[PDB]
Symmetry: C6
Subunit: 196 residues, 6 copies
């Protein structure tokens, strides 16, 4: 493994991306992948097993955990990464297909599809940011929550596992997503300006 | 690892597949594999260990879990992926075998076997969709289930683990399967139209 | 990794195998390996930890589990795969050795050893099918078993984990083994017919 | 894998780094990675599961663990490694991009960006050292802690897991970080002296 | 990965080994490695956690398990494999060193060192077989054991986990070791006969 | 992977090491790595979870385990391996750097740095042997220990997990370390004798 191969793999074979989406976006993507890898198994490993409520009612822990955590942060970020990386994979596959068909026997089409893929990537980033805002208002996570879902009688106190570490990693991931959004907007603006 | 090698591996050495089954089907397959990888161990890891029923009867948890989950969603999707990818593997092996035998010493046969493999892939997709509909009517998963299987006395309340996250991943996987079905039908129609 | 390398590795360097044992047997072997990988850790992971009996007698769970599951299905299938793949490994090593010794300085010997290896593979398949029939009569697995082994007093009710999913995977593996047996018999018959 | 490839990968393709940041910094980075790998899963694997307090109050263990360990040492060191390695990754990607753009169709710019990246690496090292000092004053870790956080009544005695082994690994990691800081300062001074 | 590379790696670069130690010994070594891999984590994974004794005395389970299992079968077989494979590694390293020193600037020495390594391998096999016989007389493993070690009062009944599956794997490993011993003796005899 | 590449990687590109540190030291290093890999997860996996004391005092198990095992044998051996392998890594990186700088545009310096690295390796081996002697006097490990650390009242009996298997692996690792020390001393003596 060399740098001239890793850089080519990350950037794809596309020849229209500038240094914003070729040197900086790949680094932020690697940063997000590494943070998700080092945080998924350890911090969020025992989010449900150590989630306890102050009650004797059977089945209250599971219903309260599902009520307060419809989908954990780790899985939300994994889905966000997959959806954000899908258009880049599509562009790389399209470039490879065009190269194959021209070998066995265009610039504007590649430029347009790259612009469309960057727009879709920005849209996915914004959609996942909005979903995270809807599900979990506020970056901070609290230690104690009040759960009144059936079958729990009245309201019970349930305790979250590692609120502070999860808050730190949430801040990191949200900052990375914001940087990605800014870089995508800058890339779109730069391409439009240079094309005109 | 380069893009011109990954694309060749995903598309095989077949020269009859169009851009529908060469650029889009491979991307959807990668998407399904990644979602299954990020959801199998985490979301469905403790589906049975944290499945509890409100009873003192020994052995009621296991019989109720088997009654309500004959085969978990993760294993159903893994089997679906294996069966769907089997015809592509067969086509790739047949192409390699034909290349080997012509090297040590046809187009219509390859075209027909590719069409048959795509038809079988579509059939497997439809069969697994129908099986999922039969076993689990409705995408949504409920928190509480009523289990009256022996040895549980009368009817007991059993609680499912992470209904909402499993519902989200079920929606994702079903949408991906539907997209695969549509793409396979489009590929078959395109091949038939172009052949005539 | 390319297709022309994977196909060569799976088929070996043998030049006597026809398309039955070169295109179809390898695919079925890959199918069995993938099914075993996706079923070994998940379905059979907690076969003993969640095996409970309705008694207060210490040590009854372990003796009952050993009585009813002398060797689990996953380990039986792993041993079957290893024993079935051993003759192919022997043939590949013999071909490599012959190539090496002819390089540093025959067809009938290779043909005979390939026929013998296919016969041994068929014999191993049949032996493991018969062993599975002896140990576990019937593909279906029951939820409740009656265990009267010492030290359990009288007869106790013990509950198996995931009978239905294990039944489904047993059906899959038995069908794959039967297909392998049929393909091996067809390969032997084809070789004998073509040699005469 | 050979030495001339591993050395090139670790040093990047940059031609301005001297032997301080090319022979010694890479070795210390490998040392830190290996220590973190051998200490993360074993020593810090059960930091929360075996963290017990001398009370009957539900939820006191989790709140006390979060109070005394806002973010564990392993995750702090992983984040420190990622942030420290980010500027080197940026420099390598920039060098690859410059090589690509000069191939498809400068020294001062590379020198300045390398100096800036080394300065940022030193700044990140210092910031993480200061954060570790703020969160955990003193290298030594105590066996018993006094926790008076809600809902724990009055003050409870909580017991930390493996204080001595964690102290040893903390000493190792802090010494490695100090060596990295000294090497970065020496590299900056050497570059400035040689440039003038 | 091809067959001509795997065969060369398994056989080393030694030019004195015949087909007994080049085609058959490597296959048996691969068989032993695969069986150990598929049996180490599953069958022997919970040998101590599910080892229970019929007593209320604290610490009796651990002392009884250590009394009856001084070193588990899996670790004994792993050590046996490592010690048996050490002389082959030494021979390969010596051949590589001789090739390097002759490149930068004998047959009898290589023949003698290969014979000595085969003798040492046979000696290690015999020693480990004798150790296994001393520690565990008889291939069969019993469900119930009588433990009278301090602090257990009088004699307690302790129950072993999966006696039958462990017996099956013990039979497999002992048969493989016996085959290895026979092949090593045959190789030594063949070399001595051909040398004279 | 071939032997001529593995041997080159293990020996580095250094041209001053004799057969003692090129054929035998690498084999012993591989032996130690393999033993540590096969013993770390299995034997020492549950050293603390199954460490129980005969008392009702909360938190006595953790304090007693930390008192009697300040740092486990596995982590001590891992740190010893890392520290022993550090000078070899430094020498390899220095050789690669010298090759790079001579390519883009000495024997005594390489000889001296190799001698210094071997001396440092011997010093690290001796230091870790002395540390192991200080922490754990005697190779044998006892089943029962007497713990009188706060908060345990008076003196309690605590039971160690797998004393005999840990004793066996301790003997193996200590013998390997002694062999490494002897080989390093022999290498230093041989180099000094041949240089004069
Ligand atoms: C389904 C699960 C997915 C999970 C998410 C994965 C996401 C991220 C994962 C992966 C992204 C890729 C990472 C490495 C990229 C570098 C490639 C490279 O430099 O290639 C170059 C060198 O490389 C080689 O010659 C060897 C290539 C080895 C790549 C890694 C192999 C698999 C790693 C498995 C890891 C297992 C652990 C992974 C997790 C279990 C190409 O060779 P070259 O000589 O340059 O070519 C000719 C030269 N010329 C072009 C000038 C003519
Ligand atoms: C049984 C369990 C199965 C599980 C499901 C697996 C399903 C998915 C898994 C795998 C699908 C394949 C993934 C990688 C595909 C890219 C290949 C590629 O680009 O090859 C190219 C580069 O590549 C190389 O030179 C190195 C090839 C490394 C591939 C990965 C090695 C194993 C990874 C193990 C991962 C471990 C973790 C996996 C999970 C434990 C080919 O080389 P080239 O130089 O281009 O060729 C000559 C050039 N010319 C042709 C122009 C003349
Ligand atoms: C002990 C445990 C065993 C478990 C059961 C294993 C059973 C199944 C496992 C393995 C079976 C083999 C799988 C891959 C086969 C494809 C090989 C191939 O295509 O080679 C080709 C390309 O390939 C390369 O250049 C790179 C080869 C990488 C192969 C994978 C590396 C290890 C994966 C580790 C995975 C880790 C996870 C595994 C589980 C932990 C050969 O190269 P080429 O350029 O074509 O050659 C020259 C070209 N010419 C010939 C035309 C002149
Ligand atoms: C997302 C998770 C990240 C975790 C943190 C990772 C951080 C650290 C990880 C990785 C850093 C890299 C480690 C190896 C670097 C050596 C490369 C090398 O020497 O290349 C050379 C040889 O190499 C080859 O030909 C094969 C390259 C294989 C590299 C490893 C493959 C993936 C390993 C997966 C590991 C799985 C386990 C990992 C953990 C799951 C290049 O080839 P060459 O012939 O020299 O080139 C032509 C020669 N010429 C230039 C003179 C013309
Ligand atoms: C410390 C833990 C140890 C555990 C015990 C291990 C014991 C057993 C383990 C390993 C034994 C070796 C297994 C593979 C051997 C095949 C090699 C081969 O065919 O090479 C050939 C092809 O190969 C390649 O080009 C790629 C080589 C990839 C080998 C696997 C990489 C690492 C797998 C990691 C696995 C991860 C999972 C492992 C467990 C975590 C050589 O190339 P070639 O083109 O033929 O050369 C030039 C051609 N010419 C010579 C004609 C001129
Ligand atoms: C951070 C965690 C660290 C843990 C401790 C690690 C310590 C030990 C680990 C690693 C030490 C190295 C082991 C293999 C060494 C053999 C290399 C070799 O023979 O190269 C040769 C062949 O090789 C190839 O062509 C492929 C190289 C694959 C090496 C393994 C890849 C990553 C394995 C990942 C394993 C995953 C599991 C690991 C654990 C998760 C070089 O190629 P060549 O064709 O000879 O070169 C040209 C020929 N010529 C020179 C004559 C011109
Ligand atoms: C500018 C940024 C966003 C570019 C990022 C490139 C991403 C999207 C690309 C680069 C290399 C790609 C990987 C290359 C190879 C494989 C192996 C295959 O079996 C599954 C997909 C997977 C794992 C790809 C996923 C997508 C991937 C990570
Ligand atoms: C158009 C779409 C459906 C094409 C998808 C291609 C799929 C079916 C192919 C492409 C590469 C293939 C893999 C290549 C190599 C191996 C290693 C082998 O030991 C097991 C099978 C396995 C893991 C193959 C499984 C099938 C596979 C994933
Ligand atoms: C026609 C069908 C049955 C052919 C199947 C081929 C099988 C038997 C062959 C093809 C490739 C082989 C593998 C190639 C390389 C290795 C790595 C080695 O360290 C252990 C054995 C192992 C894992 C081999 C096991 C046997 C294997 C899987
Ligand atoms: C002077 C010192 C600091 C140099 C250290 C070099 C570091 C920063 C470089 C060298 C090789 C790099 C790795 C090379 C390849 C990959 C695979 C990719 O999928 C994720 C990033 C990752 C894992 C890189 C991370 C950063 C890395 C480890
Ligand atoms: C005739 C029979 C006994 C020959 C068997 C060959 C054995 C002893 C050889 C062949 C290939 C070798 C392996 C090749 C590469 C490595 C990687 C290295 O980092 C650790 C050692 C290890 C894992 C070797 C161990 C010994 C090994 C498995
Ligand atoms: C004579 C004896 C002591 C020589 C032993 C050589 C040792 C020290 C060398 C040989 C090959 C080296 C490895 C080669 C590649 C890597 C990958 C890198 O990402 C981390 C370091 C690591 C894992 C190296 C560690 C040190 C290493 C194992």
């Amino acid at each position: 493994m060399n740098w001239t191969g890793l850089y080519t793999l990350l950037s794809g074979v596309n020849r229209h991306s500038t240094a914003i989406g070729r040197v900086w976006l790949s680094v932020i993507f690697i940063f997000r992948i590494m943070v998700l890898v080092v945080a998924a198994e350890s911090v969020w490993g025992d989010e449900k097993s150590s989630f306890i409520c102050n009650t004797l009612q059977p089945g209250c822990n599971s219903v309260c955990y599902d009520q307060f955590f419809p989908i954990s942060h780790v899985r939300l970020w994994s889905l966000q990464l997959i959806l954000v990386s899908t258009p880049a994979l599509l562009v790389a596959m399209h470039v490879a297909h065009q190269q194959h068909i021209e070998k066995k026997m265009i610039s504007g089409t590649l430029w347009w599809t790259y612009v469309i893929s960057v727009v879709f990537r920005l849209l996915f980033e914004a959609v996942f940011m909005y979903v995270f805002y809807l599900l979990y208002p506020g970056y901070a996570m609290v230690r104690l929550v009040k759960c009144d879902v059936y079958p729990c009688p009245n309201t019970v106190d349930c305790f979250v596992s590692r609120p502070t570490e999860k808050t730190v990693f949430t801040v990191f991931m949200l900052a990375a997503s914001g940087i990605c959004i800014i870089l995508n907007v800058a890339e779109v603006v730069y391409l439009i300006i240079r094309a005109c």
